[PDB]
Symmetry: D2
Subunit: 356 residues, 4 copies
């Protein structure tokens, strides 16, 4: 049922800022994120690793926290002013959501912060205050052939996309692209605060689950190098999907799996969305160029697998089942369909994925 | 001489949107911007060419207007709402500036628009309404090896950088980087509204003049290809400076000259500046990696040459001489100095440019 | 045995692969693919043929498209070092008992004295020295496409008995650089060279003679990406067969696409130097899931089963001989096949299924 | 003083294979070649460092030998068979050159080898036997953003280019490109054995001196990264020239200087030359696109500075002065000139370099 628009003003959200991920083996996770992927350590101890991308000046973009059950603990957005943390708290209380505020932060390098169990069951954090660190954007002495340069977005699995979309729109996120069919079903939506295609996105599925966290590279060859490195390390089985060109977003991309199966996307070269009348793009779910522009098939695991999320007590959120049609089933399942050219039988696929 | 902060609220500016350049030979200019550089035509007739970048959805990023004297006619910024055009009007009127309002626009594909003679003598346009066109961002069947994908920024030559900087800060532009010395002189500042290093910038010098308009590419090889193509067309004399890596902005770059000597920068891969406490970077004017990170010398024309700007009547604005120290003189001139490593004489340059060159 | 005995006559000194003549059924449709989509440069054309070359070529052409009733390879041509090498080629193939045809004025425009042969594997080979030089476009950056094809790199031939063909090609002066074998002693594929790259031709085990593909190179990996992107924009992504990827064998970045008659074209870049005579030969195990695609992406079955007909010297289709040796498709992705990411490790292995 | 063609057959040369450079401080040289540039160690001790590129399978491409005077000690070419070492010995003996044969090599990982003081005063080595090592071409776990993938070529400074060219042609090198003027002077020539633009090249100047050793990258961005890294390390003063696109060779390039001022070129994407009638390309010396296609000026040090070379006793070879015209002088000197378009004054430079600089 619809989530009401509060009377209270929404906080001014700048961008996605960091994710806190619970991991089971801190050493194995460090090897993946630091040794394989080259993220930069801002702080570490025996319980947590704080990591940042090459161009970041805030304390971190990723916190790995040792715990018993691998899951998303918080997806954090930075707000414009300290007063926006107050606005966030008032807004979510009006929404009837559980909130927790700590003046000294939940993780190192973040000050006054509000965590909330949002209407879709996700742990959101809003903060302004953060400890500045050395911005490594010109440290070409450190630069990796696969260098991850920015945190770009999150992607959330939720059972009712329109319900979630309206809520995020009220919160100030503008939809840039979406996937629908001719029967009124929405399968996915992308929405932004900062001037890129998205800061978060909704993928229709059983939820709440975290689909992925995405980092940017400068160039397409940097993504290719990550694949090449993973072949050399003989861990190509942890490449899930890609590399490719997205239809939706137009970005070059790759999806890989961390030691706890948390999915990480590598992403580059989407477009500017900062104008308020930025044209919304709607794709048909049966268009075989919507996810991979080259028509490469989307592996079923990409649709079915995603990370658990925690509530404010650190317990796993119960999963609610999607009743709307499944993107997997309608495109690549036994009764699925996709096309290369709308209305052309040639280059269409019935009851199977593209390319054989 | 300080420009006061108006009581009237500043318009909410989104980004640089387009420039209108007066050109003397429309066909020669079209050859440069369309045939050489690959910009996309939104409209053209005997008097004007309207051009846009690969990823743009507003009507245009560049208007070429035939006229007797080559000059910048307007640098245009898009504002967030129609109401912001009224705000801009009230703001500049409070500053004591001349303003002109046209409900149906000054150029095709722009609606209600305000043009102003700003306090630094520059013709700024503010608008919201614009005719949307086909966004070509996935038209890879059109994509050039040198494709210009966005309009990124303007750069303005002005004699008193602190005076201009304060005015633009009150307008909502935050300074991301600057160049100063230890004697209190500011030589240049970069300032933004959209989340990149800048939408405009001030370069110290006699002004008002337009230093350049900058377009972005996706990747560094795209900029390399523009150079390569200019060599194949045997117009390498129109490559002024570059390609290089900037210190300030960290962008890969190239400067080229159009048929009327309007300078165009091609630019890629600067960083995100959208957070309100984005760290402001100050480089010393004597640091030889500040403009070109690799230490390549900055050709003197880059410091001395820039385009005329017009007032609202279309007449050239009179030039006011800079009295602050000259970046050229203090770095590559007779009594100039630059260093590679602060405090190291090794890799320093005295009275000449880096890499074995002197001023011609 | 059915070995191809080494002639006493000296082998012609072969420089490199030089051009292919492909018979096509609709010349205008083929022109649109090779010129408009792929950007090859016209060296001559009329109502029956189109002659095309790559960006860095100075000989007359790398590809001749000839209108005919049945799409097929008509000749795969190698340039020899001197005019006398055409004589050597004729004596060599005559000793092998092969049908030969010598045209002192060439078979196609821009080639002079030329010998065509029905080789012992049933392939139409041409050997020539004389060719009309044309403008080398290597610095014509005013013409350069975002997907520019810069050189002709190699051919790949489907033949039933790889060792038989390999020894024949070795006698002809081709050195094997890489191959794929199993522990039981079966050879599935071999790559072999004259010029200093991984190959000028290659043998893929299968029913033959059939032409598997013709390969062109690009300068950089982004040029191959652009070809894919362009094909998506033209809504012909169904003509992208496999890739883009990193090869295991050759280490080259690659893509396979299909022309209007289903002739397969590979785009290829950045293999390694093989010109030293003791260049180390690399043998991969057939069950290694990084041998073909280094990133472990699956090889679609059509890549193993589909290939172009070849013609005899009368222009008739050559009869096909079925492979009796084990099938690479069957032993890797068929019902009883398997592959591994790490030898000996069931984690990352695939059984009776392809990867991913 | 022409060098006659021997009756004895030339050795069959495959390619350039390695250079032995004498360096004065082994640790500082190691920092440059291993830490800055990322070359791979095949062997090292207190006296020498043996280095190879990413795709090499022979033992090394570069030997750094500690010694009192920095210099080229040997430029080594691999020959096709063991018997070609005997052919090289007979060939150079017929030429009247000093030869030294060591059945177990001069440096580690090379077997039977011949070193000669060649007719141009250069120390050449010919060998077949070399210890194979792990070919790192797919070791993407090691791959750096600036990875050097192959040894491509040498470049030699010699006073009489036609005299040297003839000698190298008799040895089997074929000329691919050269630079001449209308009055019949030759300034430079490029020549090959393997199917690239060159394995060695001759630059007119006082000699024998070693101009540079060149390594390849996969892509242009790899060269850009080397520049970026040198800026981050605050050693941009060791970037001599570039990055650029060459006219001659069409390769993307960069020139940097090691701790002893030995010049290293980074290079990529030249073209195939393996056909025996490969078209030769001759450029006019006044063509400002011949060296840098984009017309960027050639720094005077590029023309004047080069490394000493040693004789077989390890003593520095005496230098012979060039008497033919100087490329520096005829192009960028006070009486030089260059053009963008032949015959066009627009885009031409007289008495100075392109882009607005004169000689420092
Ligand atoms: O199938 C693969 O991926 C192996 C491979 C390597 C080199 C090639 O040129 C080719 O066509 C196939
Ligand atoms: Ca001072
Ligand atoms: Cl997707
Ligand atoms: Cl600059
Ligand atoms: Cl040069
Ligand atoms: Fe994503
Ligand atoms: Fe700029
Ligand atoms: Fe191939
Ligand atoms: Fe060189």
């Amino acid at each position: 049922n619809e989530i009401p628009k509060p009377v209270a003003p929404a906080p001014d959200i700048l961008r996605c800022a960091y994710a806190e991920l619970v991991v089971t083996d801190l050493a194995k996770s460090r090897n993946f994120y630091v040794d394989v992927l080259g993220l930069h350590v801002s702080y570490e101890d025996e319980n947590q690793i704080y990591l940042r991308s090459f161009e970041e000046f805030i304390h971190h973009n990723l916190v790995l926290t040792k715990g018993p059950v691998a899951a998303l603990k918080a997806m954090a957005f930075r707000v414009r002013t300290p007063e926006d943390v107050d606005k966030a708290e008032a807004y979510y209380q009006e929404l009837g959501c559980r909130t927790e505020r700590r003046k000294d932060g939940f993780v190192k390098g973040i000050g006054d912060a509000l965590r909330v169990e949002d209407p879709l069951g996700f742990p959101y954090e809003f903060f302004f205050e953060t400890t500045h660190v050395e911005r490594l954007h010109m440290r070409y002495d450190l630069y990796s052939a696969g260098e991850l340069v920015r945190l770009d977005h999150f992607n959330q699995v939720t059972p009712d996309v329109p319900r979630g979309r309206k809520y995020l729109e009220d919160l100030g996120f503008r939809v840039t692209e979406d996937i629908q069919d001719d029967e009124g079903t929405t399968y996915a939506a992308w929405m932004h605060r900062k001037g890129t295609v998205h800061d978060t996105a909704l993928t229709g599925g059983n939820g709440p689950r975290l689909h992925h966290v995405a980092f940017s590279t400068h160039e397409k060859h940097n993504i290719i190098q990550i694949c090449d490195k993973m072949g050399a390390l003989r861990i190509s089985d942890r490449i899930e999907r890609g590399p490719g060109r997205h239809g939706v977003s137009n970005a070059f991309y790759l999806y890989i799996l961390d030691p706890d199966n948390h999915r990480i996307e590598i992403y580059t070269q989407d477009y500017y969305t900062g104008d308020p009348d930025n044209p919304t793009i709607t794709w048909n779910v049966h268009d075989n160029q919507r996810r991979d522009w080259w028509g490469n098939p989307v592996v079923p695991s990409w649709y079915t697998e995603a990370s658990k999320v925690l509530d404010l007590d650190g317990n796993v959120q119960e999963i609610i089942e999607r009743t709307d049609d499944s993107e997997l089933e309608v495109t690549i399942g036994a009764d699925g369909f996709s096309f290369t050219r709308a209305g052309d039988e040639d280059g269409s696929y019935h009851g199977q994925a593209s390319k054989g």
